[PDB]
Scaffold this active site. Structure first.
Site, PDB file in Angstrom:
ATOM      1  N   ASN A  30       0.881  -1.157   0.000  1.00  0.00           N
ATOM      2  CA  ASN A  30       0.000   0.000   0.000  1.00  0.00           C
ATOM      3  C   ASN A  30       0.915   1.203   0.000  1.00  0.00           C
ATOM      4  O   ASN A  30       2.066   1.064   0.400  1.00  0.00           O
ATOM      5  CB  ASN A  30      -0.902   0.034   1.255  1.00  0.00           C
ATOM      6  CG  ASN A  30      -0.172   0.377   2.512  1.00  0.00           C
ATOM      7  OD1 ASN A  30       0.815  -0.268   2.876  1.00  0.00           O
ATOM      8  ND2 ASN A  30      -0.680   1.358   3.222  1.00  0.00           N
ATOM      9  N   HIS A  41       5.674   6.031  -7.312  1.00  0.00           N
ATOM     10  CA  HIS A  41       5.984   4.725  -6.728  1.00  0.00           C
ATOM     11  C   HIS A  41       7.430   4.616  -6.196  1.00  0.00           C
ATOM     12  O   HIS A  41       8.358   4.952  -6.917  1.00  0.00           O
ATOM     13  CB  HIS A  41       5.672   3.624  -7.754  1.00  0.00           C
ATOM     14  CG  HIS A  41       4.211   3.600  -8.137  1.00  0.00           C
ATOM     15  ND1 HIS A  41       3.332   2.677  -7.573  1.00  0.00           N
ATOM     16  CD2 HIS A  41       3.509   4.426  -8.944  1.00  0.00           C
ATOM     17  CE1 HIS A  41       2.137   2.965  -8.072  1.00  0.00           C
ATOM     18  NE2 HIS A  41       2.187   4.005  -8.895  1.00  0.00           N
TER      19      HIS A  41
END
Length: 195
Positions: A30, A41
DNA sequence: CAGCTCTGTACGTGAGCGATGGACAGCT
DNA sequence: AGCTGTCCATCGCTCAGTACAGAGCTG
């Protein structure tokens, strides 16, 4: 985080970077606080993901979180997470959240159908396997998993979390072996398609 | 008993904080 | 020579899942 409250980051989400015909989809647990902040990311300055991507040869140059949108087109790599909600840590998430996540994840994988679904973390594959394949092995291992995503040819490959939190793989160097084996598996699959 | 599941504990690196203080230069 | 402030090197410290023991469960 440059005057941005933790309370504000917890409401934020990280968009997926997904397309069809991908070789690999990196599935994180998560978003952490820094990922929610940056909107990219694995921005964790200590996270091993980008270092390992380069040290393994999955990227020919050293990249960083700002490069994540170029990964589908240039490297055949995409990104998603098991759970959408941002938390300071992985243990802040509930069993129902993970199983909701798993269901949502399998639908995304059945749509995009990448050559390999890469579980960036053993803990998330433990949940996924139980929910999707109804399998609970005592000796769950990293590496290629013996089950394809249902109704697809997508393989499941598990790596130790790129998070620098686990002491068992203290450095990026200790995880690089799995990224090299991931690269080799991708090369074998593309070679199978060719011949 | 014997295999499970569930729960709590323990664990290595390295990046980057705030605090500290040494080096140094400008100014008298 | 003395004073004082900035800069920056350096330090101590924090912190970003996995494995496994043992309690509990149950066939």
């Amino acid at each position: 985080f440059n005057g941005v409250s933790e309370a504000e980051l917890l409401t934020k989400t990280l968009p997926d970077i997904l397309t069809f015909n991908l070789d690999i989809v990196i599935i994180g647990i998560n978003p952490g606080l820094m990922a929610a902040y940056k909107g990219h990311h694995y921005p964790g300055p200590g996270n091993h993901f980008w270092k390992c991507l380069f040290m393994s040869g999955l990227s020919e140059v050293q990249l960083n979180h700002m490069d994540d949108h170029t990964l589908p087109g240039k490297y055949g790599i995409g990104f998603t997470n098991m759970v959408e909600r941002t938390t300071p840590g992985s243990k802040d998430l509930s069993s129902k959240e993970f199983r909701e996540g798993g269901r949502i994840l399998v639908q995304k994988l059945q749509k995009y159908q990448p050559r390999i679904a890469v579980f960036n973390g053993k803990c998330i594959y433990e949940i996924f396997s139980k929910e999707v394949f109804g399998v609970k092995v005592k000796n769950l291992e990293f590496g290629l998993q013996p089950h394809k995503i249902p109704d697809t040819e997508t393989l499941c490959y598990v790596m130790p979390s790129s998070s620098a939190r686990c002491a068992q793989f203290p450095r990026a160097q200790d995880k690089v072996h799995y990224y090299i084996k991931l690269k080799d598996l991708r090369d074998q699959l593309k070679g199978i398609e060719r011949n």
